[PDB]
Structure 1
Amino acid sequence: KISLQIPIKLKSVLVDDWEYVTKDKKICRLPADVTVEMVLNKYEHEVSQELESPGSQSQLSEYCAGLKLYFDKCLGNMLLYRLERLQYDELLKKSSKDQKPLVPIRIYGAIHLLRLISVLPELISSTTMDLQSCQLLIKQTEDFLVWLLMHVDEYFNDKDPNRSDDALYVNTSSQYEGVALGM
């Protein structure tokens, strides 16, 4: 049994994301004005100077790089709803048009990183990982989560797509709805 202490503010952010995608039929603005790398880099550059332990610095950089690699390899697998898979398809075709492989680090926003964090304990329980690595990875994820509360007003804002173009979510079209949830 592996447990994660996600704050209820970020839990409500994830539940609002679920609301917007499944009920309100909203997808994310891609690429966001603030991506996932951009959050895993600013968190590293903020908590890197918070302590003067070089082994802890190595562990923090290790966690950030592993989270980035995990995000890229797992976003296409299990990190986005059925509605957003069409947007994923058009992003992949647009990346193949200009002959650059699609990397989810520079494209997807911090809400998908929060999704990866929320689904992370089930992935931890599904691999032959020893207790020490599980405990330290859970601890590092918890520290990143409590870092996210201090910057929850600048990564997860609340904006109506009908009023602001700078909202994190966008309204979808009927053609997108038909192709996404009709075939």
Structure 2
Amino acid sequence: ISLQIPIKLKSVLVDDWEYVTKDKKICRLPADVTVEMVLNKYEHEVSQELESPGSQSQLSEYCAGLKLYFDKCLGNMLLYRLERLQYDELLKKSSKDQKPLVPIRIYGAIHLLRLISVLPELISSTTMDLQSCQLLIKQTEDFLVWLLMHVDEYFNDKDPNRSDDALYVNTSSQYEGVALGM
């Protein structure tokens, strides 16, 4: 049921939690890397490092299912109380130019890993068969193993105080006051 989150990525999640709550920092809205580019890197890299007996079929199927999962379940479990007004203003800007509300291509890999970690919280409370569960756990473990090597390129240790490539924008006093107000 519970997937083997590596201890490095657990430290990454705790660091993100510290940045969000204690350090009061939120992710870049116009992030240079979102879920689209990390999955593009997945399909560009992992395809040629293994044989092709048909695993690409359910591999791409799981990638598409994850992409669909990241849309509706983003506004359900994700968005720590600081990020609610940034979500509101993002959807307002999307609706300003009549663009459809598509929030998957906005948030980076931090929210992707956060959604990955929150899977056993709601997987257990439904009629969901173990036969697909074992395969999903194994391939997600492969996903975390791939992310391990890519963790320095994707979650590089930087802060939003002297450069703009830290994948983080710091909270403002008005934004901090109004985000935790309502």
Report the TM-score, using the length of structure 1 for normalisation: 0.95
Q: Secondary structure at the match of 1:166?
A: coil
Gaps of 5+ in 1: none
Aligned equivalents of 1:119, 1:31: Cα separation in 2: 24
* Cα deviation digits, residues 106-142 of structure 1 (max 9, x gap): 1100000000010012222122110011111111111
Aligned partners of 1:31 and 1:107 also within 8 Å: yes
Q: Does 1:3 align with 2:2?
A: yes
Residues 22-66 of structure 1, C-alpha deviation per residue, up to 9 Å, x if partnerless? 111101111211111211221122111222234211011011000
Residue 170 of structure 1 deviates from its aligned partner by 1.2
Report the equivalent of 1:66.
Answer: 65
CA contact (8 A) 1:31 1:109 kept: no
CA contact (8 A) 1:28 1:170 kept: yes
d(CA) in 1 for partners of 2:43, 2:143: 9
For residue 95 of structure 1, report the CA deviation from its aligned partner. Answer: 0.3
Shift of 1:17: 0.3
Q: Could you tell me how far 1:9 is from its partner in structure 2? A: 0.8
TM-fit CA distance, 1:10: 0.7
Partner of 2:130: 131
Give 1:67 shift: 0.5
Q: In structure 2, what is the Cα distance between the partners aligned to 1:116 and 1:96?
A: 25
| Deviations 1:67-124, CA, capped at 9 Å, x for gaps | 1000011101111201011111110100010111222221100000000010012222
1:18 to partner: Cα distance: 0.2
For the 8 Å contact 1:6–1:145, the answer to whether it is kept is: yes
The residue that corresponds to 1:83 in the other structure is 82
- Between the aligned partners of 2:142 and 2:113, the Cα distance in structure 1 is 13
Aligned length: 182
Identity across the alignment (%) = 100
Q: Which residue of 2 is the match for residue 141 of structure 1? A: 140
Residue of structure 2 in register with 1:14 after alignment: 13
User: For 2:107, what is the secondary structure of its paired residue?
Assistant: coil
The answer to whether residue 45 in structure 2 is matched with residue 51 in structure 1 is no
Q: Structure 1 residues 127, 45: closer, same or farther in 2, change over 3 A?
A: farther
For 2:171 and 2:51, locate their aligned partners in 1 and report how far apart those are by CA, in whole Å: 47
Instruction: Describe the SS at the equivalent of 1:54.
Output: coil
TM-score in terms of structure 2 length: 0.96
Any idea what SS the aligned residue of 1:105 has?
A: helix
Deviation of residue 3 (structure 1)?
1.5
Secondary structure in structure 2 of the residue aligned to 1:89: helix
Whole-Å Cα distance in 2 between the matches of residues 60 and 126 of structure 1? 25
